[PDB]
Amino acid sequence: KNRAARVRVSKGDKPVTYEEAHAPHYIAHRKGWLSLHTGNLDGEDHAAERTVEDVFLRKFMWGTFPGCLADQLVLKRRGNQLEICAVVLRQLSPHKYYFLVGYSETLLSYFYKCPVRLHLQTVPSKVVYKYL
Template sequence: MALSPHLMKFVSESLKVRSVANRIIHTSSTLQKCQSGRYKKTLKNDFPLTYEMANPPHAIAHRKSWNSWNTTNLDGGLRASETAVEDVFIRKFMVGTWHALFVSEIIIKRQHNIIRIAGILRRSVSARKMYFLIGYTEELLSFWLQCPVKLELQTVNDKKDVVFKYI
């Protein structure tokens, strides 16, 4: 199929404009500059990374999707903005209540009307204080969010037990 001369002139002129614009702006492919979300390599390889931190950005959908199962962000989902605000509030409350004890990310799982909060803690407080903090956190968050809240916490002896690799 041959193009008409008028259409051929239009196509050639539009290609010239694009090529001139590319030389002036210096646009590059997005695949060449994939650096966001990556940690810089240190000289002594002494920077610890957890499993979540060690995953590259292109693997987020495959390896880290279980950290954010939240169906309110789907098209037509209800309460998308309220859920985001509640998640930020929950994370800030947990970090403030369990000060310097979390060695992993705080994972929030929403299933029906139950909110389950998971994470890994250092074993540096007594069992009595740990049980008090669990009850305190569950009770206050359940009251504020008007739904049942359950904590699923695991403990480790040292922060180094959570390190996946060093870079």
């Protein structure tokens, strides 16, 4: 009996997402990686910094877009340029959405001394894979 990044089977009243449902040993078999960089590859370096500041990015953006997201993020770092992809709901106003978009993008760029971009996908209700 192992407990690792997996949801307990309940009576059947727990909507779950794809990755939130599937186990951590199918990350390559039936899932994709949340992040894509080369520090893990051989010969590269600074992978520790990559991971640490990626965790920081995830936490900061999760807490500066609270209650709107419904899934984990997608990182995409091509050379210099950084890209983040998110999914959110449409309860708040596009005014606030764009204001926070610009604010967060500027903060990330000024902090990392790096060109950054961020995209969001709107949803009326978070997509559920199964009822667990």
